[PDB]
């Protein structure tokens, strides 16, 4: 893996370009003996990750599908989130995330859900660990289903205004050196790059499935080098409005120029239902 002044090379796990062209893809989170766990495989592919820091303030959610915003929070809230304080996450941090999205987008309503505190080499399952496969958190069907599930009677009225789904990512230890969150220019995503994958649990059908991405040389991947706890990444998973980037995609990668004995990456990401705004 080589690198330069504003980019480096690594790899991420992609699905095949023809994945799901014969049957629906599924991945059993709780695999049981006798039943097939998955009908597809991820494969690593070389990717050039361009450093976003030289042009950090120039990426916006409409043109690229992601943005980086300065937002400082108290070190006490960080240590509480690091201590698995569920009350601090669903209370103070949810209010912090909603206020940050409101002042960035001017939106009317923000609904937080599905918090994921991650640690490198953790044991809190897969979702307490950095993501290794390139994904978009919600398909359009998943984003609409989540609105009806979390907003209920107000879903139809809210879906008449602009609806967006965000992943609000923030590191808990700084700076992020290893396993950073890469993001792709949404304008460089082809429709053939998106593959719905149903994550199964005890045979329950996944009505909120994500997109899994296949590699493409056209994809321009970015990452904010040495990201700090005061720099928040907002990655767009869905957008009802037709913009140059209807969505983005994200994944973590092994940085090739970081010492092996570096402290493990720690972060928390929260999904957002965003209504209105610009
Ligand atoms: C390697 O990267 C990953 O495995 C991703 C990941 O880390 C997580 C945490 C996920 O959460 C998903 C799918 C992803 C994006 C996976 C693909 C599933 C598995 C649980 C929660 C749901 C939910 C909130 C109900 O919304 C849905 O639309 C269905 C898909 C998500 C967003
Ligand atoms: O933090 C990671 O490694 C992966 N994060 C996400 O998938 C997210 O924020 O939605
Ligand atoms: Fe994600």
Author numbering: 1 to 278
Quote what the paper states about this structure.
Phe127 and Trp199 in loops I and II, which undergo dramatic conformational changes, may function as gatekeeping residues to load the substrate into the active site. The substitution of Phe127 and Trp199 with Ala completely abolished the enzyme activity, while the E208A variant increased the activity to 144%. Furthermore, the substitution of Phe127 with Ile and Trp199 with Phe dramatically reduced the endoperoxide-forming activity, while also forming 4 and a product with m/z 461 (total activities were 6.7 and 25%, respectively). The product was determined to be the C-13-aldehyde 5, which is generated via two rounds of two-electron oxidation of 2. We solved the ternary complex structure of the NvfI W199F variant with 2 and NOG at 2.3 Å. Although the overall structure is almost identical to that of the wild type enzyme (rmsd value of 0.8 Å for Cα-atom), a comparison of the two structures revealed that the space around the carboxyl ester of D-ring and the active site entrance is significantly increased due to the substitution of the large indole ring to a smaller benzene ring. As a result, the D ring of substrate moves ~1 Å toward the 199 position, and the substrate is not suitably accommodated within the deeper part of the tunnel, while the C-13 position is still close to the iron-center to generate compound 5. In contrast, the increased activity of the E208A variant would be due to the decreased steric hindrance between the carboxylic acid of Glu and the C-14-C-15 dimethyl moiety and the clash during the conformational change of loop II. These observations suggested that after hydrogen abstraction from the C-13 methyl group, the bulky aromatic rings of Phe127 and Trp199 shift the substrate radical toward Glu208, thereby blocking the hydroxylation at the C-13 position.
